[PDB]
Amino acid sequence: KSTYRTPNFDDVLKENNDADKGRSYAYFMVGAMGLLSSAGAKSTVETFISSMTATADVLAMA
Amino acid sequence: MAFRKSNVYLSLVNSYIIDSPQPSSINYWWNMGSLLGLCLVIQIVTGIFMAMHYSSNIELAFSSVEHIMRDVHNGYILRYLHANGASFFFMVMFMHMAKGLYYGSYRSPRVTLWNVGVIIFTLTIATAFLGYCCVYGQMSHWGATVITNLFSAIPFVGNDIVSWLWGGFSVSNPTIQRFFALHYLVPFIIAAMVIMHLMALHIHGSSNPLGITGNLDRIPMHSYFIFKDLVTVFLFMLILALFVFYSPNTLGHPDNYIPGNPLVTPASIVPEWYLLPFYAILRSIPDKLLGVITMFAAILVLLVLPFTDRSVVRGNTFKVLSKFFFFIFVFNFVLLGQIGACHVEVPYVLMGQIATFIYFAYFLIIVPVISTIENVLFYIGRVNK
Amino acid sequence: MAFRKSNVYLSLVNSYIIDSPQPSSINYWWNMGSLLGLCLVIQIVTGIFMAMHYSSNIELAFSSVEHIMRDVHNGYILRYLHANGASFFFMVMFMHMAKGLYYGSYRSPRVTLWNVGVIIFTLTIATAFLGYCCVYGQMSHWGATVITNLFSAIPFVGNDIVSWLWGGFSVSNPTIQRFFALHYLVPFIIAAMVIMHLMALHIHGSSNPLGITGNLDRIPMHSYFIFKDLVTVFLFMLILALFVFYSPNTLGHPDNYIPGNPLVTPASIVPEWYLLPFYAILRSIPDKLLGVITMFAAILVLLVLPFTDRSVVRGNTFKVLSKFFFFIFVFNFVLLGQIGACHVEVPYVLMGQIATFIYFAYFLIIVPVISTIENVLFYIGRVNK
Amino acid sequence: SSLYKTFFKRNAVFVGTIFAGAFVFQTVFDTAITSWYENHNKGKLWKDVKARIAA
Amino acid sequence: MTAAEHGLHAPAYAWSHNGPFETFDHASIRRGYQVYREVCAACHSLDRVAWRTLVGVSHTNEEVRNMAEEFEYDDEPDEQGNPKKRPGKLSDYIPGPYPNEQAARAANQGALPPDLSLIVKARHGGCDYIFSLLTGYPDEPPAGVALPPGSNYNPYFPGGSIAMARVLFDDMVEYEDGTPATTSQMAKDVTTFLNWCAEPEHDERKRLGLKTVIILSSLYLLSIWVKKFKWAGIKTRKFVFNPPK
Amino acid sequence: QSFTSIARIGDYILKSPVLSKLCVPVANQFINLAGYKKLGLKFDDLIAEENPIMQTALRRLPEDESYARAYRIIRAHQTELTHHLLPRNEWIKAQEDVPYLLPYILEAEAAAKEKDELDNIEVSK
Amino acid sequence: GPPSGKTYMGWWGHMGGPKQKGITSYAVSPYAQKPLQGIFHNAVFNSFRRFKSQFLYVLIPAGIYWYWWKNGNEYNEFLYSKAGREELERVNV
């Protein structure tokens, strides 16, 4: 076969009438994963940091 | 060159995590190792924050853990993460090991990689036992008693080792204070052994599911397997979260919510689930010395597999008899654990003794015989003279 | 090739300890680094064995250390090794740093090496403070109080940091239990930083007393410097032994044999000797915020020396003015420490403020001016036009 | 989708916007969940029991 | 092992706190405290529960203060060093009936009534077990069973022979909220109260879990999508071989 | 296990028409169940190569077979990662599943065995 | 630098594979490809394949062990019931 004759990718290629379809989907997904991760990391860090604050049993009102 | 390459610290990161050439075809079974590193981090971080609130004195240890549960903000989350994480650490380790078994990862040139792995496994088992003792519930006290007594089986100087390990006449304050100190230490030795594990991994690279060379088609770690790792990291966290928040005590033992009592061993005593197969193996031998020898040998026999696997191809993917007997091994191992959870009673004692035999026979007999037969079958099926 | 080269683990040992090419002319001042590794090992080993007997509860901590002194076989040896070893660790660190200062070891291409060193120094100071608090004598309690309060000087959110560090209203049980947990951790982070220190050392090798290239005449680490290291290892042990057995409390403070008392600060309170120069610097500034800023800056200003040393040759060996002012710096540093040990009284307050100025002026003013002058003197003394 | 190309316009979302959105999410999400949770458990809460006691 | 030695399997009752979205019923907790105070506390300590934890859970700040002050606790010695006592405060732990173990065994035929702070977590079966035990004393033991003197029969206890007699009987308690104090109602209530004692973080823990599981679920589904995108070039890659001359 | 040893046992079976008619059908069915032909591989492509015998052998392989092995291996990895098998018309047929590397392996094992024999020869006077 | 043991993997540009010639590969940007609503219709009758080959290797050992477990358990139950206390006396010690 001739290397200039590119194999068929038609089953995979998005029939491009909308150019930035996959880009907008990918960047939304990547953006949303970034959002929920940062909120998750923030909550995880606060959980640990707050375990070092005064314990419920040592807050005595003398 | 790029800074990630030229800098002394970053180049380590680059060669292990970014540009590291991976075989294109490794499947999700190769995600377990990163999950083990993650587990190691979860155990260390949650343990240090708990240590801040923990007292190792035998009078105070159980109450100091109740104090973490009740008074420390998010304390129950730390404790339940640690306890359930230890279990998840073993689930994933068994899968990592089973993966290695199936795909011939223990084979040359990765024998050193495998041997260091077996050391990590022993260290991880010892670390979890030390931690379990620190709670000082009923299972803690008698676990400490039974396991330190393993060494009394040693000829002549055995009871001397035990009293030295105890720091006195029985499992007491000296014992629990030194077991906490040791529980803190060994995770860091495991960390150093993991680095040695990754060093041996790096010089030959990962294997792959076909069992053949990966040299003809590599893709970089970065992007492809970084984000593929992320998929199983989140699935792992999801499931660990379901236990920690919704079912935090399902993988433990109710007797360890009872303070340890030196005068009473509960009838309901059962080892931690991840120790059950090994427990069963020991219990199957009606002799003290030989019971503890056979149990230790059940771990060391993992070292024998590079020599008893006689096959000429790496891994079980294209091997009909080896696949079948591999799953005999796995389900035999589950049975050993179900026997461990049972009473020393009629059908169970014999089943455990036969399952014990099957366990050892796999490495020493089945694999060498079957892999030889498969060698010959592959040959006479294609050669015409 | 030889096995020590071909094996994955041994080759690390070979390239760092056996075949590592050393400049032929390095003198005994280059023995301090191995003595620091030895110190780190002594502190970790003796600390772990003591941890086995130590209780971190604020009610029990002081008595648990008396228990190590009285009841633990060879317990007084462990405690005195640890306490005196911490001091010896600082003596040797100051000498290692002073060596670096004198011979221009901070210079390019060893800037990264120097910067990692400054981090280790900060970590080592924090580690010793955490350990000192664990005794919970009088000096422990007020040391913990004064030093955690350093952070109260931080704008707006400072008192919040302090109450978070304390775990309550004042230095109490939460505080001492978390300081023990942290004291156990940080030595292992120091160990990881030492590895990063040796990594940066390895790519450029050691400097030497002439300040010029070592590339024309190397001799292997093994034999020559292994046995040369041994000479100072034994001398170090001899002297440490004289203190541990014959004078074990000469480098400490009698007030720390009194249990901590939250209501009474002794009139005789004095910081540990190795913290005195820095203490004096803080005490010289009659403002809270600026006192703690200037003291921290006295450590960070070490980072500035690669930029303010304008000379065109590495090291002070052939530099008459630089040698003189180097020893002004050293003896000025000793004075700062002698001021720290004194009362806040007339002559001393002014002397401390002037010595503080001299300390900073050395890095920021004297070295840039003098090294420029020496540059020009070297030139006009040989050029005839 | 063209909802993306109005806000971010064929470019990826930047860390600053991500971090900012996360702070917003944290508060909104917490209130939404606490609300659903307390409602789902109406009758059983201490809030609800205190409405039937007075002394 | 024989069924008697194992003990009868406790059945699954429909507790209102069972289920991932379910809080405790706090009215049942309130009632359960009364049953504990008026029946159980005569033999059973509750050492790990401090008065303050009741506030906002089952009682008001004022109610708990009155309850704590009904008890005397050791105080700091006076100016001269003689011991002295003190009414209880919210920082104190709920006091037990006996001063030491030996005094507790003396009052119970030599048996030791366990502390109940953790009892729900320290037994297989949890709430189902505790409830079933309390409501499962038969008027007479099954035929042939020879009970030791001072022992009682209960099929749910391992071995059948338990040193605690039945103590719940209809209307032995006057519920402050009007509820008919039947034995199964009182059992249901203390047991709910004892689950809270053992798991005070229950309601909050499940609320946090709901958030954690939603975020992690989303992150999981999201990462799958992102992985597939990042792999699409490799997965649909195509090779051709033209053997070299 | 050496290929010299597999060849010894295998050839003994292949000649004696008692065993030959008994085993080869079993072996044929084992090979089909193995499945490697559905990935486009020949058995000899499957031999673990990280040892000196196999490196000697692969070194000695003629160019055209070498390029062909390379394609079959790359094509196998790509198909494996897509969780498919090849189109059936692309499978390796039994006529193609030849021991192409075997003669080079056996040759190298014999050379190696002789060196080991000669390095350890005793002498008698 | 410090020397090095010969291995069976190199790095980019010298991986240690055989010389490759004649193989030509093609690929297409993920950006240019159909957003992930494809799989299904084309790929769900496809997969669920790789476990038709495998399920017997798992299921038959699983079956053997589950049967063996259920049997031993039901036997233990019989032994400790009334009906079996005679057999219990026989098989015990």
Ligand code: HEM
């Ligand atoms: C009040 C309603 C009440 C409760 C609740 C209760 C519970 C309880 C449990 C759950 C146990 C543990 C049983 C086990 O081991 O599984 C237990 C044990 C004993 N109790 Fe009790 N108990 C209640 C009330 C009373 C009262 C008022 C008394 C004293 C007269 C009493 C006594 C005991 C004793 C004794 C035991 C020990 C049982 C044994 O070891 O055999 N309880 N109780």
Ligand code: HEM
């Ligand atoms: C590989 C790492 C580790 C493993 C597998 C591990 C495992 C365990 C286990 C099984 C327990 C008992 C869990 C239970 O409560 O039922 C435990 C307890 C404990 N561990 Fe670890 N541990 C590890 C590391 C650490 C580290 C580094 C610390 C740091 C001090 C630590 C501190 C503790 C403490 C304080 C306890 C008692 C609290 C508790 O019971 O959860 N652990 N550990």
Ligand code: HEM
């Ligand atoms: C804390 C424990 C461990 C960590 C962090 C760890 C980590 C890793 C990592 C990152 C990999 C590469 C990815 C993978 O194949 O999953 C790996 C590979 C491997 N590990 Fe481990 N491991 C651990 C324990 C073990 C154990 C217990 C064994 C065996 C007894 C072992 C045997 C192996 C082998 C043989 C490989 C190579 C697999 C192959 O490429 O085919 N590991 N490990």
Ligand code: HEM
């Ligand atoms: C770079 C390492 C370390 C340094 C510089 C250091 C320094 C110190 C210092 C200054 C003290 C107080 C000495 C005194 O009694 O006057 C101390 C106490 C203590 N250290 Fe360390 N330490 C180190 C590592 C460790 C480690 C890894 C442990 C392990 C748990 C440890 C455990 C303890 C204990 C148990 C005490 C209280 C006993 C005593 O007062 O000597 N230390 N340490």
Ligand code: HEM
């Ligand atoms: C626990 C602490 C440390 C350890 C174990 C350590 C160890 C070493 C070793 C083994 C060497 C080579 C031999 C020698 O020159 O003595 C070295 C060199 C060096 N270290 Fe450190 N070091 C430590 C702390 C520091 C600190 C605190 C600094 C400076 C702030 C520092 C600065 C340097 C420099 C600049 C060199 C190169 C000296 C030259 O070759 O001229 N080190 N260190």
Ligand SMILES: COc1c(O)c(C)c(C/C=C(\C)CC/C=C(\C)CC/C=C(/C)CC/C=C(\C)CC/C=C(\C)CCC=C(C)C)c(O)c1OC
């Ligand atoms: C060729 O094969 C590979 C491969 O090489 C790699 C790297 C990966 C990817 C996986 C990894 C890189 C795993 C890496 C992780 C480790 C080696 C972790 C080692 C363990 C540790 C425990 C780290 C050390 C941690 C600590 C000391 C804890 C820090 C403590 C803190 C911050 C305490 C804070 C608290 C207070 C109060 C100050 C692969 O997936 C892979 O095959 C596909």
Ligand SMILES: COc1c(O)c(C)c(C/C=C(\C)CC/C=C(\C)CC/C=C(/C)CC/C=C(\C)CC/C=C(\C)CCC=C(C)C)c(O)c1OC
């Ligand atoms: C080019 O320049 C160099 C150079 O590179 C080197 C290497 C040296 C020689 C010096 C060294 C090699 C120093 C090396 C030492 C270290 C890096 C040490 C790191 C620190 C540690 C703390 C080690 C880790 C230790 C532990 C975890 C402790 C082990 C604990 C145990 C056994 C507990 C046992 C107890 C019980 C109950 C089980 C030079 O002298 C030199 O210039 C002349």
Ligand SMILES: C/C=C(C)/C=C/C=C/C(OC)[C@@H](C)[C@H](OC)[C@@H](C)CCc1oc2c(O)c(OC)cc(OC)c2c(=O)c1C
């Ligand atoms: C300082 C450190 C010391 C002294 C000890 C470390 C080393 C020991 C081990 O391996 C490293 C050891 C854990 C062993 O490994 C063979 C495990 C498989 C243990 C298996 C094990 O568990 C039990 C257990 O958990 C129990 O709990 C309630 C009770 C038990 O009896 C009823 C056992 C038991 O009978 C056995 C064999």
Ligand SMILES: C/C=C(C)/C=C/C=C/C(OC)[C@@H](C)[C@H](OC)[C@@H](C)CCc1oc2c(O)c(OC)cc(OC)c2c(=O)c1C
């Ligand atoms: C979790 C860890 C935490 C919160 C803290 C770690 C970090 C802090 C430091 O550096 C890392 C810190 C030690 C500082 O470094 C600038 C040292 C030079 C401290 C110098 C120091 O010592 C004193 C001391 O020892 C005392 O004893 C009786 C008493 C003291 O007053 C009278 C002091 C004092 O007035 C100062 C400035």
